[PDB]
Amino acid sequence: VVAQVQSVDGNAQCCDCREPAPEWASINLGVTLCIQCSGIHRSLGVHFSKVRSLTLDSWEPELVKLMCELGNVIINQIYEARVEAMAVKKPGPSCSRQEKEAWIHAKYVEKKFLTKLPLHPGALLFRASGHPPSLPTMADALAHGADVNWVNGGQDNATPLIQATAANSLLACEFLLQNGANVNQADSAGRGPLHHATILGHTGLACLFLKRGADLGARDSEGRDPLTIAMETANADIVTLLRLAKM
């Protein structure tokens, strides 16, 4: 895991201070962090950063893949975009804990070094979550305040998660879920991500949603729960998943 995640462009230097061989990660941001900067990320709370060990914790295959599609270079291009323009000074490995704290807080909480525009972060997240998904754009949209549960109003009332489901993108779903997407948020027709996974026959996405606490009994505007759709579409694999999840 640590060899695979550190092998990504720029992931062998800490995202925040460039400390070599970082063994920690933020799994919602998609970055590698050194002992000291990971310690500081823990200060921020789960809304900003979910800290994990590359060496000490288990990693789901999809999440390893997610890390490999983002990484320090991509995320710094977003979160440190205007550093060079602001003539401001990024901390090095040997810098004080306090200097690193002030940088990390300015970078992720204050959002101090972002560009002005990722004009519509929510809509952009929506567009970037759909086929073909752009994870760097999704990350950019999220940094600029995109609602992870953005509703496509006046239209179908779909969400970025529903878009990622239509795209059959495990990576985009995973990224949205890591960033707080409501696994149960339905469209105008009462169809949540699990409903869409089942309609489209995406067994892997259905499995993901069930693992993340998707509501098995949720009925759409046609009175169908996901099992009903799975039966009606003659999909033996999803039927089996759903019945097992019920037990």
Instruction: Tell me which residues touch Zn ion (CB under 5 A).
Output: 14, 16-17, 19, 34, 37
Q: Following DSSP, what letter does each residue of the chain receive, concatenated?
A: -HHHHHTSTTTTB-TTT--BS--EEETTTTEEE-HHHHHHHHHH-TTT--EEETTTS---HHHHHHHHHS-HHHHHHHHTTTTTTTT-----TTS-HHHHHHHHIIIIIS-TT--S----HHHHHHHHHSSSP-HHHHHHHHHTT--TT---TTTT---HHHHHHHTT-HHHHHHHHHTT--TT---TTS--HHHHHHHHT-HHHHHHHHHTT--TT---TTS--HHHHHHHTT-HHHHHHHHHHH-
To Zn ion, the closest distance from the beta carbon of 38 in angstroms equals: 8
- Comparing CB distances to Zn ion, the nearer of 24 and 126 is 24
The least CB distance from residue 47 to Zn ion, in Å, is: 21
Complex with Zn ion: residue 100 or 196, whichever CB lies closer: 100
**Residue with the closest Cβ to Zn ion?**
37
Q: CB of residue 214 vs Zn ion: minimum separation in angstroms?
A: 36
8/227 with CB nearer Zn ion: 8
Compare residues 100 and 144 and give the one whose CB is closer to Zn ion. Answer: 100
Least distance to Zn ion from the beta carbon of 33, Å?
Answer: 6
Residue 92 CB, shortest distance to Zn ion, in Å, is 9
Pairing between β-strand 51-53 and β-strand 31-33 as defined by DSSP bridges: unpaired
Nearer to Zn ion, 97 or 111 (CB): 97
17 or 124, CB closer to Zn ion?
17
User: Shortest approach of Zn ion to residue 139 CB, angstroms?
Assistant: 19
